[PDB]
Write an enzyme that holds these catalytic residues in place. Structure first.
Site, mmCIF file in Angstrom:
data_model
loop_
_atom_site.group_PDB
_atom_site.id
_atom_site.type_symbol
_atom_site.label_atom_id
_atom_site.label_comp_id
_atom_site.label_asym_id
_atom_site.label_seq_id
_atom_site.Cartn_x
_atom_site.Cartn_y
_atom_site.Cartn_z
ATOM 1 N N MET A 45 -9.578 1.006 -3.485
ATOM 2 C CA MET A 45 -8.880 1.382 -2.264
ATOM 3 C C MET A 45 -8.578 2.883 -2.317
ATOM 4 S SD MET A 45 -5.962 -0.485 0.085
ATOM 5 C CE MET A 45 -5.887 0.195 1.761
ATOM 6 N N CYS A 66 -4.695 4.333 -2.797
ATOM 7 C CA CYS A 66 -3.586 3.392 -2.742
ATOM 8 C C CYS A 66 -3.363 2.950 -4.178
ATOM 9 C CB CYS A 66 -3.962 2.202 -1.861
ATOM 10 S SG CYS A 66 -2.872 0.776 -2.047
ATOM 11 N N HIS A 92 0.816 -1.198 0.000
ATOM 12 C CA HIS A 92 0.000 0.000 0.000
ATOM 13 C C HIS A 92 0.857 1.259 0.000
ATOM 14 C CE1 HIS A 92 -3.598 -2.420 1.469
ATOM 15 N NE2 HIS A 92 -3.015 -2.575 2.664
ATOM 16 N N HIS A 124 -4.011 -0.522 -5.687
ATOM 17 C CA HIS A 124 -5.364 -1.012 -5.453
ATOM 18 C C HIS A 124 -6.411 0.063 -5.768
ATOM 19 C CE1 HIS A 124 -3.002 -3.793 -2.621
ATOM 20 N NE2 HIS A 124 -3.423 -4.524 -3.669
#
Ligand SMILES: [Cu+2]
Length: 99
Positions: free
Chosen positions: A92, A84, A37, A87
């Site tokens: 995300m 992120c 991340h 993602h």
């Protein structure tokens, strides 16, 4: 405020995702689960006064191992949307409101 990257159960969500913080809040982001991340701010969805590079974890780098943390101080009031990168497609993302 302390934000967990992943809701423990591997799910690719920022906990919290959408929220509010006071001016000058020191936001901490920790690799909980579902890593790797990072926290990149959307250059448009930020108050112009604060250039994205000042709040975004450089794309080149990322919180690869569990436990790893990132920290950012949101001085100026406004709406700061973040994501992120690895993602983003998985949703995300998040939105922090500097009250
Ligand atoms: Cu991620």
């Amino acid at each position: 405020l302390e934000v967990l990257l992943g809701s423990g159960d591997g799910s690719l969500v920022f906990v919290p995702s959408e929220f509010s913080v006071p001016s000058g809040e020191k936001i901490v982001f920790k690799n909980n689960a579902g890593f790797p991340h990072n926290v990149v701010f959307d250059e448009d969805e930020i108050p112009a006064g604060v250039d994205a590079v000042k709040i975004s974890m450089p794309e080149e780098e990322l919180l690869n191992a569990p436990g790893e943390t990132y920290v950012v101080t949101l001085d100026t009031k406004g709406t700061y949307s973040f994501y992120c990168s690895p993602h983003q497609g998985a949703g995300m993302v998040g939105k922090v409101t500097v009250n």
